[PDB]
């Protein structure tokens with residue numbers, strides 16, 4: 137009463153501003169951390185996708201060859217005894233593309249600097 | 263002193279409210295972006311999991327068959343010459359289920375609209 | 389005018405503080421949710437990586453063996469008729485490590501409790 141109300145409000149503002157700005161920084165860090173983590177997942181997921189496809193590609197080739205050789209062999213035996221397998225090329229791994237979301241997270245982190253609070257200070261309390 | 267303290271506090275409130283609301287919108291965007299990115303990762307990861315399992319399934323079948331045919335062949339040769347391989351069915355890819363976390367991110371984004379600040383305006387300064 | 393300005397400012401502060409604190413809690417929840425989701429993705433992605441590698445390992449072994457057996461067979465036939473395949477060991481799935489980002493998200497969530505606003509109350513309005 138004696139003259140504190142005006143002073144408590146200002147102190148409250150300084151806290152509000154300090155706590156908010158503190159939180160923003162924490163949030164920016166979390167965003168960058170999420171984008172970084174999302175980016176690593178994308179790399180691994182895609183590299184593993186391409187590994188699986190590269191494999192299917194070779195395997196298909198192998199079974200085509202194996203079935204061919206066994207056929208030749210069986211054939212010979214026939215002649216000798218006379219004288220005397222599913223393809224997997226369709227299996228495909230897809231890749232993910234979240235680069236746009238990753239870039240968006242970094243932009244938002246950078247832009248939160250524009251949402252910080254620059255409290256007008258009252259000398260009479262500073 | 264002349265009569266500004268009451269006016270600086272209000273201006274500070276308008277900034278606090280404008281900057282916070284601005285940040286909330288930015289954060290909502292980041293959440294939706296994260297959920298969208300998480301959702302795409304889940305789809306690809308699971309589709310690649312199922313591709314790998316579908317493959318193991320066929321491959322096991324193939325090696326069972328190949329070993330069988332080679333055995334028959336070797337057998338014949340025996341008769342002809344007389345007259346004259348690990349299974350992989352156990353390899354399994356697991357799938358992930360983060361749908362609940364994805365839905366939770368979208369709900370939080372929607373609910374932050376309920377955390378916006380509607381500052382009571384003082385006509386004497388408006 | 390009669391004496392409300394001082395009272396509207398305080399009411400505005402209570403709202404600012406209530407809405408911010410409410411948002412912080414919402415954000416903490418979103419962070420924990422993101423970390424939990426990121427953690428599940430890491431587990432599945434890595435487990436699927438290791439499954440793919442375990443498979444390549446066995447497959448390479450299988451084709452080495454198959455080519456060997458077919459060679460022996462073809463060889464015999466030669467003798468009998470006389471008397472009468474790419475390796476994939478190089479395909480490798482990589483694993484991801486975002487544990488550090490996951491732990492960082494949880495720390496930030498825990499630390500936001502230190503960014504909450506504890507508004508100094510003015511009895512004259514309470």
Ligand SMILES: [Cl-]
Nearest residue numbers: 149152275401
């Ligand atoms: Cl305020």
Ligand SMILES: [Cl-]
Nearest residue numbers: 181184307433
């Ligand atoms: Cl994967």
